[PDB]
Structure 1
Amino acid sequence: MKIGIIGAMEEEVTLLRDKIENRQTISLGGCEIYTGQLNGTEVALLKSGIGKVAAALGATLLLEHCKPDVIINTGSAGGLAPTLKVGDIVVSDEARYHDADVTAFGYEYGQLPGCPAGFKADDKLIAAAEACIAELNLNAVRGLIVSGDAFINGSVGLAKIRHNFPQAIAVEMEATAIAHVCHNFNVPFVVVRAISDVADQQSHLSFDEFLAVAAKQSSLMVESLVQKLAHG
């Protein structure tokens, strides 16, 4: 098994990258892919850069150049569900765009024509993630993650998301793009992120303070998940 891992920011990939043995770097299309072994398992770790198009470009290169068997999206997220605190884990069962709108032609809010309204994460990957959460005694919520190209910071931006996706557990800027690419290539995916902020008026301050905390929790989860998948 080769496990593909995608993170947007330096801070979200640095802990995993440092653990990769025999590390090689592919530099293509403005992104970096690091290949080698993570606790004995072959991995390909993409640092994509921020937002939907960066993520889409990077994921496409990762799939084409490395042919990973599955994709895990790691990093931070803005928490939306009431029981989430900084550091807590969010696991996708599904990803949707919160900023896509072709409802004038009768598509569901968030749905682009030619796509399902949402992209479902892989059941086996979800189950493995939940097993790791249990083993590591972490607080986690499984559910809908929504993506757009905006850093959510209270005001009207948060309000629109709570209005249109009251079931969304977290918001970020890459997951659904990754999900979409994986859908089109028929590659299983899961998102395993951790909370850096609660997407309110203070979220920029919380993000600066707690990105590192969130990166560490997600990275430790991903390390555990890689091991669990490779062993099983």
Structure 2
Amino acid sequence: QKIGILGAMREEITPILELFGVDFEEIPLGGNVFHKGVYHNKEIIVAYSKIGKVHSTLTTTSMILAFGVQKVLFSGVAGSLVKDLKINDLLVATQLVQHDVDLSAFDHPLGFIPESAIFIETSGSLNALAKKIANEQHIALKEGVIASGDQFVHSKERKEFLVSEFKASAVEMEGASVAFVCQKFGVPCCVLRSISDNADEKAGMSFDEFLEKSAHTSAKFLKSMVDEL
């Protein structure tokens, strides 16, 4: 069984390599460093894509086509758009949207691109598994729509826009592209995110503080999922 685990930054996958503690062979390809290893019975490929839609799309496509992963789990941090999502909170994405896509000039709704869709879906099977686990571990796992764009959102004006337009709960910069690539190749995808800030004027300061912790919370939960597979 082949499983891919992606992170955007190195700081997001370092804990994953720790927690697994197995020997990882390092395979470089297309500017990314893939860590191939073996866990219990499963074959795990880990990597950080680097920041953004382009980077994350490249890596996910590479993972799938070069290593043939049969599932893809993502784990990293995000900025909270809602009052009931607090720092360190866990969330699993039901739908993802590219909030910065704009073809309005062609009388198209924001986030839409022809031959595609505004919202992209994630694995219903995996999202279930996460709910099961979050339940046994007594963890308050929330769920919702995640917004993705190539901008670091640090302002209330954008916060509101995202929530009203797309009804999003959290923002980040790679979730939508991973889910999108996985969808086009028929690979079940699950996107886990841990809250590192509130995407406000202070978003930058807070992000710097909690990155490390939030990355761990996220990493821990994902490990427990890989254990149940």
TM-score > 0.5 by shorter chain = yes
- Secondary structure at the aligned position of 2:181 is classed as helix
Note if contact 2:81-2:159 (Cα within 8 Å) is conserved in structure 1. no
Shift in Å, 1:136: 2.0
Distance 1:108 1:132 in 2: 37
Farther off after superposition, 99-108 or 120-129 = 99-108
Structure 2 match to 1:121: 122
- What does 1:96-111 correspond to in 2, within 5 Å? 96-111=97-112
**Uncovered stretches (5+) of structure 1, i.e. residues with no partner:** none
TM-score, normalised via structure 1 length: 0.93
Distance 2:222 2:215 in 1: 10
2:224 corresponds to 1:221: no
Count of residue pairs brought into register by the alignment: 228
Shift in Å, 1:139: 1.9
Distance 2:141 2:168 in 1: 14
**Uncovered stretches (5+) of structure 2, i.e. residues with no partner:** none
Query: Percent identity of the aligned residues?
Result: 34
Shift in Å, 1:11: 0.9
Give the counterpart letter for 1:95 in structure 2.
Answer: L
Distance 1:132 1:78 in 2: 23
Structure 1 match to 2:154: 153
Q: Structure 1: which 4+ aligned runs deviate by more than 4 Å?
A: none
Distance 1:145 1:29 in 2: 27
Note if contact 2:52-2:173 (Cα within 8 Å) is conserved in structure 1. yes
Give the counterpart letter for 2:196 in structure 1.
Answer: S
Distance 2:189 2:108 in 1: 24
Structure 2 match to 1:178: 178
- What does 1:33-72 correspond to in 2, within 5 Å? 33-38=34-39, 40-72=41-73
TM-score, normalised via structure 2 length: 0.94
Distance 2:76 2:36 in 1: 18
**1:113-162: per-residue Cα shift (whole Å, max 9, x none)?**
22122110111010001112112222221111110001111143324323
Distance 1:201 1:85 in 2: 16
